[PDB]
Amino acid sequence: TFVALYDYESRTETDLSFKKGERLQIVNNTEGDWWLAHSLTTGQTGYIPSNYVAPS
């Protein structure tokens, strides 16, 4: 379970924009600066920035 350290405001329909306090399920993340998480509310997918989230 990861947490949004900053309110990610995506601009395209590929990544989901999340605010601070919202949690996201990290999928793949071990190098690229952009990871892909999956929300647990509706169940959507979106590449979340690796600088707007942190393990917690």
Partner: peptide, 9 residues
């Protein structure tokens, strides 16, 4: 206040 500038993909 301003989050870090999104890195380049």
């Amino acid at each position: 206040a301003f989050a870090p500038p999104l890195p380049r993909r």
